[PDB]
Amino acid sequence: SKRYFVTGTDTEVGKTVASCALLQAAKAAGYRTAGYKPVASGSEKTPEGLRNSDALALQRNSSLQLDYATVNPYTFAEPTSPHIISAQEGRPIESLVMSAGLRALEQQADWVLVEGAGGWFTPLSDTFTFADWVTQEQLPVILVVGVKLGCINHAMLTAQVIQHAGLTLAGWVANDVTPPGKRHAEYMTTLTRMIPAPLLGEIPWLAENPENAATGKYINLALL
Amino acid sequence: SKRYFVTGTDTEVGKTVASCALLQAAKAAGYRTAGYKPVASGSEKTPEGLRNSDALALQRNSSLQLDYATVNPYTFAEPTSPHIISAQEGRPIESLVMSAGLRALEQQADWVLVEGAGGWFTPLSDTFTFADWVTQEQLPVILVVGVKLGCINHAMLTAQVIQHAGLTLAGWVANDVTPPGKRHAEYMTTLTRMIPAPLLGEIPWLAENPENAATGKYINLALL
Ligand SMILES: Nc1ncnc2c1ncn2[C@@H]1O[C@H](COP(=O)(O)OP(=O)(O)O)[C@@H](O)[C@H]1O
Numbered sequence: 063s064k065r066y067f068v069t070g071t072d073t074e075v076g077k078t079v080a081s082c083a084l085l086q087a088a089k090a091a092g093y094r095t096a097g098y099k100p101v102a103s104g105s106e107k108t109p110e111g112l113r114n115s116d117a118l119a120l121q122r123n124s125s126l127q128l129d130y131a132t133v134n135p136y137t138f139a140e141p142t143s144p145h146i147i148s149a150q151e152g153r154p155i156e157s158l159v160m161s162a163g164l165r166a167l168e169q170q171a172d173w174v175l176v177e178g179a180g181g182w183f184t185p186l187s188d189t190f191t192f193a194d195w196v197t198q199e200q201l202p203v204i205l206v207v208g209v210k211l212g213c214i215n216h217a218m219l220t221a222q223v224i225q226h227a228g229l230t231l232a233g234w235v236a237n238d239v240t241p242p243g244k245r246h247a248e249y250m251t252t253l254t255r256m257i258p259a260p261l262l263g264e265i266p267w268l269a270e271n272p273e274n275a276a277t278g279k280y281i282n283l284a285l286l
Numbered sequence: 287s288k289r290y291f292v293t294g295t296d297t298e299v300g301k302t303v304a305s306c307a308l309l310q311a312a313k314a315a316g317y318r319t320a321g322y323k324p325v326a327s328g329s330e331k332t333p334e335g336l337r338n339s340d341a342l343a344l345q346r347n348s349s350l351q352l353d354y355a356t357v358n359p360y361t362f363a364e365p366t367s368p369h370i371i372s373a374q375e376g377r378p379i380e381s382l383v384m385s386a387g388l389r390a391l392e393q394q395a396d397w398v399l400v401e402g403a404g405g406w407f408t409p410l411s412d413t414f415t416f417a418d419w420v421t422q423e424q425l426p427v428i429l430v431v432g433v434k435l436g437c438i439n440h441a442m443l444t445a446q447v448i449q450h451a452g453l454t455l456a457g458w459v460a461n462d463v464t465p466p467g468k469r470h471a472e473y474m475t476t477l478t479r480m481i482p483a484p485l486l487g488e489i490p491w492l493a494e495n496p497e498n499a500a501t502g503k504y505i506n507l508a509l510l
């Protein structure tokens with residue numbers, strides 16, 4: 063099974079928008095796809111339980127028909143760091159459960175995209191971060207970068223930390239979170255020479271519901 | 287001369303507000319102080335030339351009477367990355383000039399605070415970053431962290447990168463950039479166990495002009 067972990071340079075850089083574009087491109091290449099969001103906070107109440115919008119986006123951009131709990135085993139209502147609300151609720155986030163869920167998806171999908179929560183160093187308990195699980199699983203990493211002032215620094219910090227952990231940085235995706243601005247081309251050129259991995263594509267600024275937008279065409283899956 | 291470099295977890299975390307609080311505390315301890323902002327972009331036109339507001343803040347929180355060019359030798363009008371506007375204007379940012387300016391201040395001040403521009407990895411040319419100069423000068427680093435969601439990840443990334451470069455992380459400052467929110471105490475506890483350096487103090491949310499506020503009392507200079 064090909065498997066990739068998707069992380070972002072900051073909260074709200076469009077990591078889910080880029081994950082839906084990647085899933086769309088993979089579907090278009092003929093893969094049987096599955097999105098996996100093991101941990102999610104910031105969720106709505108429904109008759110069936112708590113449902114997170116990013117996990118719902120991954121669920122319906124998957125080519126397989128998947129149950130929600132398969133896509134997102136840990137769901138918390140409050141939008142804070144997972145280790146805080148996990149401790150508040152008395153519901154430990156277990157590494158074994160996160161890994162069993164990924165194996166379960168590997169029985170039916172041959173292309174699996176794993177989306178983290180927040181940024182690289184999001185804590186899952188007081189002694190365990192998301193980065194620890196990713197390193198354990200030896201997942202190759204795709205970095206999503208929102209093209210804005212501040213992103214050069216954050217992209218460089220994240221890229222260096224992943225490489226220090228002995229992980230493969232598979233590529234990065236540029237996401238245009240704002241309208242056309244004055245130094246867009248120079249930011250793209252700087253980011254391209256400084257991130258030691260191929261740029262997989264750039265998603266334009268899309269004003270209406272970009273998660274449901276057909277964005278697979280912006281991704282060149284041949285560089286992965 | 288004691289010398290410290292101040293960096294931030296993200297643009298606009300209050301790195302200048304915390305620098306003014308640090309300068310105020312140092313003045314109160316009896317040091318002859320000087321703030322130094324070698325590179326600045328985002329500046330106003332005046333009869334005397336371009337003047338940057340952060341450098342002006344450092345200039346009048348210094349206990350010595352200093353000329354502006356002494357505090358800020360490189361001033362650019364456009365608020366973008368220094369390497370872009372430096373290249374546009376044909377005005378190279380020279381490491382020798384940045385270091386000569388710091389020595390000039392060391393002839394009259396015995397406590398010097400150096401403020402960077404942007405975050406840790408801000409490029410000054412295509413082959414040279416701010417981090418390269420700080421490592422060259424062997425400056426101890428103070429990290430300013432805005433207490434918000436996303437900051438745990440960014441504080442951990444910056445702290446790890448500084449330590450990998452063989453530099454001393456002297457301490458960190460918590461800056462409350464927003465009003466009292468629901469998980470403030472848990473964010474402060476997480477940040478305190480994860481940053482490998484002493485918390486020097488916490489600056490509260492101050493609605494009016496916090497650069498001119500008397501904030502030295504929030505800093506415990508004895509931990510530096
Ligand atoms: N390309 C884009 N164009 C317009 N809005 C975007 C784009 N990418 C992200 N956004 C918006 O930014 C917000 C966060 O996006 P999301 O994909 O959920 O990021 P993250 O997974 O990092 O939290 C959403 O409102 C989303 O619609």
Ligand SMILES: Nc1ncnc2c1ncn2[C@@H]1O[C@H](COP(=O)(O)OP(=O)(O)O)[C@@H](O)[C@H]1O
Pocket residue numbers: 294296297298299300301302303304340461462463489490491492493495496497
């Ligand atoms: N403690 C605070 N209370 C209220 N506003 C703050 C506080 N700290 C920073 N700000 C505001 O945030 C903005 C950026 O602050 P600044 O010190 O210049 O940060 P930076 O040097 O990282 O750019 C300014 O408008 C500043 O007044």
